[PDB]
Design a protein around this nucleic acid. Structure first.
Ligand SMILES: [Mg+2]
Ligand SMILES: [Mg+2]
Length: 755
DNA sequence: GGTACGTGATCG
DNA sequence: CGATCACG
């Protein structure tokens, strides 16, 4: 009766065996199940058809595949009774081999639940929930530093340091002499990698924490381990970490453990212009962290001078990764438990995918047939669908932020907004959405409204248990639990409109918007009669000020205002005071910038802090934002842009500030469109350079005729005497696009930002 | 074990 | 223009 941390399957004598990884009174336990069978459902035109359908065949791994057993079942689909056939298979890999053969059949109307991974199928069907109980897990943070030189192939340079940290402290393994108490000196890169393997096997952590270990630390360790002819038996079954393709990036799993990569977690949880470990640590713990750049690390390693500085940086990377892991894991653990899927998968999911996993489990519990994901055609048509305010211009002072999101679950429940209740035939009583006119049947509670009501009731009970609890330990745990419910409940509104959703419903999303708007118009009116000016309104919230008022007065009146409105609004409809800002400006929907009273700049949909934008554009943008938010001076910002563009015209900007970086993601011959970085890469390959995916190309755009691709040069080939950069390209395609959206909030056009 | 998302630049 | 490509 332990705590489930993960589930997977292995194949033995061609048959699948489910593995359930558990933590039981401090011990690792692995449970095996050989009896759970894979399946799909088929809706037939007539029961007679089953005789032809059950005899459908496929091929996989040299052997033919068959439907093992067929079972007629009664379920609910679209809020209606339905009869479907459960088609059993021997192996989960049989489903993608046979599903289209079954769908093709003239007597098959449709197939269902055919893309549910076997391990997730098991957890749902067996009613098993990960991360339950008070079982205390162990953690280890791991990081690495590599020797890197400009534009090298991924893994060419050796790993030079490996760091790790836990409650026992932060340590470094290196293969050059460094005299520090936390540094372990070994003889080679090979021996350093073997020492990390030995630390992991001996500490036997349940959780391995990394900062972007999915794309950097583990892929690099695996590439270097390959070149060195050594294994990484990091799995509790002695398997090597496994790379999984998630999008165009990677996801790394370590069997029997939780590889907890903070990078996708932090990116979703907090809003920052850059997700450097230093920026993240400072945002969470309000403490500064020093960065040692790759070129400084290379110089120190090659010279053998300044190595103590590099080992201190490596040690801190692990130490802060450990502190951030401990800060962010409790919430990921409660979200896992709430949706009933492992932390590994949940920590790497969007809120929309968390909702879908909660719905899939609840669908099995309620005997409801799950709808299919859209095909390419349907997915694109949803992206195209219409769904039928503009911010105040200028620079505003003393901005109060109000959040609307905790309004929508209540609207979904009271109006029974669900795809299964939308425009029902022979409906006795219905709710009509204002303006849009969509009808939602009142005769039965909809699948989604029913679930949401249970979620909200469960949160109220947790909150009541928190007030009546004298134990600070359970109060902490219950606090993460009610927060996890709030996060899941507030994701449903956005889920109805998510184009990849199974329970997608455009009319549901518009109806919720139409009913929500009546409360938004009430808030807006009540604020305006109180002297407040509304500057920005989104379905998510609003920003307001009291023009010419004192900051404490704006705060006091706003805090009084939320207390008042919440007392007027029925049920669980709730307005939330998000915060206060010293200054701010708004461009369009989700394109704005603010500054708090502590001097921190918070922006949405404006900042370009990425390697594929030149330093000159990023530097000019940061300077424009500082002139506006820190100096309250838009005229200073306009003068900054005019000076920079003139300097580009007169070749007064250093070439190092003009470099663009773009990664090669495939073999060069696989490109359809030859962008500047690929044109530069082809020229390098023609010279004998081993161009491989992962290589990052640095280039400068030169003056000349034609498209930019024909005028781009590799940075290492740029000679300031011979080459002349394209000033027009850096003015019009780099610097002005970086600042034109920001300046538009003050009445300037691209044309107003030059002499 | 199915293999992200939203967004904005550049190619053809 | 529509298609293709990359960032984090
Ligand atoms: Mg897994
Ligand atoms: Mg590091």
């Amino acid at each position: 009766a332990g705590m489930i941390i993960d589930a997977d399957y292995i194949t033995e004598d061609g048959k699948p065996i489910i593995r359930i990884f558990k933590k039981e009174k401090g011990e690792f336990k692995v449970e095996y199940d050989r009896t759970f069978r894979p399946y799909i459902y088929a809706l037939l035109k007539d029961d007679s058809a089953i005789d032809e359908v059950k005899k459908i065949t496929a091929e996989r791994h040299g052997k033919i595949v068959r439907i093992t057993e067929v079972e007629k079942v009664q379920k609910k689909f679209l809020g209606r009774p339905i009869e479907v056939w459960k088609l059993y298979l021997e192996h989960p890999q049989d489903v993608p081999a046979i599903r289209e053969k079954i769908r093709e059949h003239p007597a098959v109307v449709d197939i269902f639940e055919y893309d549910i991974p076997f391990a997730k199928r098991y957890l749902i069907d067996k009613g098993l929930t990960p991360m339950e109980g008070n079982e205390e897990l162990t953690f280890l943070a791991v990081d690495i530093e590599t020797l890197y030189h400009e534009g090298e192939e991924f893994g060419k340079g050796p790993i030079i340091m490996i760091s790790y940290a836990d409650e026992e402290g932060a340590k470094v393994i290196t293969w050059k002499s460094i005299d520090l108490p936390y540094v372990e000196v070994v003889s080679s890169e090979r021996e350093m990698i073997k020492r990390l393997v030995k630390v992991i096997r001996e500490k036997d952590p349940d959780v391995i924490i990394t900062y972007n270990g999915d794309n950097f630390a583990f892929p690099y360790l695996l590439k270097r381990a390959e070149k060195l002819g050594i294994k990484l038996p990091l799995g509790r079954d002695n398997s090597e970490p496994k790379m999984q393709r998630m999008g165009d990036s990677l996801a790394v799993e370590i069997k029997g453990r939780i590889h907890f990569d903070l990078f996708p977690v932090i990116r979703r949880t907090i809003n920052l212009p850059t997700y450097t470990l230093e920026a993240v640590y400072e945002a969470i713990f309000g403490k500064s962290k020093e960065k040692v750049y790759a070129h400084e690390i290379a110089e120190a390693w090659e010279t053998g001078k300044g190595l103590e500085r590099v080992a201190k940086y490596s040690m801190e990377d692990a130490k802060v990764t450990f502190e951030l892991g401990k800060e962010f894991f409790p919430m990921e653990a409660q979200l896992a438990r709430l949706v009933g899927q492992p932390v590994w998968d949940v920590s790497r999911s969007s809120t929309g995918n968390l909702v879908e996993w909660f719905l899939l489990r609840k669908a099995y519990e309620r005997n409801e047939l799950a709808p299919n994901k859209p095909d390419e055609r349907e997915y694109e048509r949803r992206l195209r669908e219409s769904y039928e305010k503009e911010p105040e211009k200028g620079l505003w002072e003393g901005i109060v932020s109000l959040d609307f999101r905790s309004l929508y679950p209540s609207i979904i429940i009271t109006h029974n907004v669900s795809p299964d209740t939308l425009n029902r035939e022979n409906c006795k009583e219905y709710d009509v959405a204002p303006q849009v006119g969509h009808r939602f049947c009142k005769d039965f509670p909809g699948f989604i409204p029913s679930l949401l009501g249970n979620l909200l009731e469960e949160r109220q009970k947790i909150k009541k248990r928190m007030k009546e609890s004298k134990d600070p330990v359970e109060k902490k745990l219950l606090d993460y639990r009610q927060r996890a419910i709030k996060i899941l409940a507030n994701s449903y509104y956005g889920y109805y409109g998510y184009a990849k959703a199974r329970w997608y419903c455009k009319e549901c999303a518009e109806s919720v918007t139409a009913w929500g708007r009546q409360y938004i118009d009430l808030v807006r009116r009540e604020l305006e009669s109180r002297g407040f000016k509304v500057l920005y309104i989104d379905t998510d919230g609003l920003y307001a000020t009291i023009p010419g008022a004192k900051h404490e007065e704006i705060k006091e009146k706003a805090l009084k205002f939320v207390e008042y409105i919440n007392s007027k609004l029925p049920g669980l409809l709730e307005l939330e005071y998000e915060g206060f800002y010293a200054r701010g400006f708004f461009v369009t929907k989700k394109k704005y910038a603010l500054i708090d009273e502590e001097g921190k700049i918070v922006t949405r949909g404006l900042e370009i802090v990425r390697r594929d934008w030149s330093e000159i554009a990023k530097e000019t943008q940061a300077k424009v934002l500082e002139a506006i938010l820190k100096h309250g001076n838009v005229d200073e910002a306009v003068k900054i842009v005019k000076e920079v563009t003139e300097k580009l015209s007169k070749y007064e900007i250093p070439p190092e500030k003009l470099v663009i970086y773009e990664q090669i993601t495939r073999p060069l011959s696989e490109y359809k469109a030859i962008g500047p970085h690929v044109a530069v890469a082809k020229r390098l390959a023609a010279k004998g350079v081993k161009v491989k995916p992962g290589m990052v190309i640095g280039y400068i755009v030169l003056r000349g005729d034609g498209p930019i691709s024909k005028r781009a040069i590799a940075i290492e080939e740029f000679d300031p005497k011979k080459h002349k950069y394209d000033a027009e390209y850096y003015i019009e395609n780099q610097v002005l696009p970086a600042v034109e959206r920001i300046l538009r909030a003050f009445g300037y056009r691209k044309e107003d930002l030059k002499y």
